[PDB]
Amino acid sequence: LNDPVHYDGAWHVYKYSDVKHVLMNDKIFSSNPGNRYSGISFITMDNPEHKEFRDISAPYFLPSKINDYKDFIEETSNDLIKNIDNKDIISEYAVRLPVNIISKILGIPDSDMPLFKLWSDYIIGNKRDENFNYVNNRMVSRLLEIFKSDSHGIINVLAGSSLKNRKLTMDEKIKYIMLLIIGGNETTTNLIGNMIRVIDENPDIIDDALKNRSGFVEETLRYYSPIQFLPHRFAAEDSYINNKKIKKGDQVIVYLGSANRDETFFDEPDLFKIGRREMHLAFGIGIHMCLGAPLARLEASIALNDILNHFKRIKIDYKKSRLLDNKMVLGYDKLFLS
Ligand code: HEM
After folding, report:
1. Taking burial as the number of CB atoms within 10 A of a residue's CB, which of 89, 163, 245, 318 is the most buried?
2. How far apart are CA 19 and CA 204, in angstroms?
3. Domains (ranges, CATH) in the chain?
């Protein structure tokens, strides 16, 4: 891999130790600009205000609390995989799974599920229409009603929340929920398609995958990282990487996929090996390390198990399947088997 280069108004950072240095130094490399370049809610906040925001939901994302959702995710995954044969695995299984799970965790009522899913599609970007304005207005309306009833989910927690000498705004509550929906959907959908791609490419991996689902999910994260780069870091003060001065104000783009293929940290980076020792950076690292990582881990793990037990043979049909076009992420636009 390359030392940091500057072009198109940003530094590009590729090496694993440099990606990590940047992400671990939140006070040197900030998460929001000096102004306007557009990330919502606490993802774009710096360390102090950010912790206040993240703590509101942090306890409910511990692998401990998340695990109470295991039977629900199994039930859901099974319902959708039952009868998927011959269909688009992305739109009929991989998109639908994370959106069901997240509505359960949020506390979206049963009777609001159809509209939540339409709104969710618009908002993560899976849909674009005239209907947007209408559907957003309809969903936000329901949202306000839910905030004032109660459940055990996040909506209810955001209702009873403040942090440090100040109540949460209603725009903050919506954006908070929006950040959960947007950061957990496409990424989980992309991972599911990327695990299917590993299987397609390494057909005798299957037995080992079954014996260590976690391990297989970890190596996919490393090897076909759903998120390829994070474009939004800005130097809060001058500092040096590989003897280059990164000046205050400079945008710093950090490449996770590329860092996850660094031969300095991974022996034989271009091979798929379950049970590697070093941590991958697919979920980032530091104070912004993925809030949904335990949930994502548990969803992928059940998805793998279910996909592996449903099909005998897994060949991707490349005359109908296509990779997404966006360079920032990695996944299938559509995926058809066999
Ligand atoms: C396989 C799935 C995922 C991958 C590869 C992924 C990747 C990431 C990365 C790289 C970051 C850090 C961005 C930064 O440092 O600026 C992040 C943050 C975040 N993710 Fe995930 N993510 C995934 C799934 C999920 C899920 C299921 C959720 C649940 C709603 C979720 C919610 C969040 C939130 C709220 C943040 C920001 C945390 C903070 O800024 O403190 N993600 N994710």
Report:
1. 89
2. 33
3. 1-338 (1.10.630.10)
